[PDB]
Ligand binder design. Structure first.
Ligand SMILES: CC(=O)N[C@H]1[C@H]([C@H](O)[C@H](O)CO)O[C@@](O[C@H]2[C@@H](O)[C@@H](CO)O[C@@H](O[C@H]3[C@H](O)[C@@H](O)[C@H](O)O[C@@H]3CO)[C@@H]2O)(C(=O)O)C[C@@H]1O
Length: 115
């Protein structure tokens, strides 16, 4: 079945890093490269944190501070956020595109960054 599995909320500290564990799934009948995209505040600012298809789409606010630590071939979508700022608090949502066969996790993971 289609889905993304990750903690609902995670806490982080200013200046530190945060690794959001992530595993995704899709039906075995779907023909398969997979594009990985992580959004920040999808329903609002909708800024691109990670984009494996075209890194040029990444918002300047995240360039050099975020990296996809997962192996898409192994269905791992781990997100590493570096040099955390209080402004990084908010919800991050993963989206993967295969080919109609695309999926956006509406749940996402909410990050809280304190001093
Ligand atoms: C396998 C599959 O069916 N993939 C669909 C996906 C998934 O259903 C979805 O990602 C699961 O979360 O939906 C696709 O279309 C959706 C996409 O365009 C999003 C963009 O935000 O909107 C969805 O419609 C929403 C709409 O935006 C809301 O305003 C409304 O209240 O609810 C609608 C849903 O009922 C689209 O369904 C996708 O690309 O993600 C199409 C894939 O084929």
């Amino acid at each position: 079945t289609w889905g993304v599995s990750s903690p609902k909320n995670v806490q982080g500290l200013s200046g530190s890093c945060l690794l959001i564990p992530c595993i995704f799934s899709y039906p075995a009948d779907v023909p398969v490269g997979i594009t990985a995209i992580w959004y920040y505040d999808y329903s609002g600012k909708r800024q691109v944190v990670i984009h494996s298809g075209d890194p040029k789409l990444v918002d300047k606010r995240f360039r050099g501070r975020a990296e996809l630590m997962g192996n898409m071939d192994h269905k791992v979508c781990n997100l590493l956020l570096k040099d955390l700022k209080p402004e990084d608090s908010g919800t991050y949502n993963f989206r993967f595109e295969i080919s109609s066969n695309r999926w956006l996790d509406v749940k996402g993971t909410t990050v809280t960054v304190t001093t």
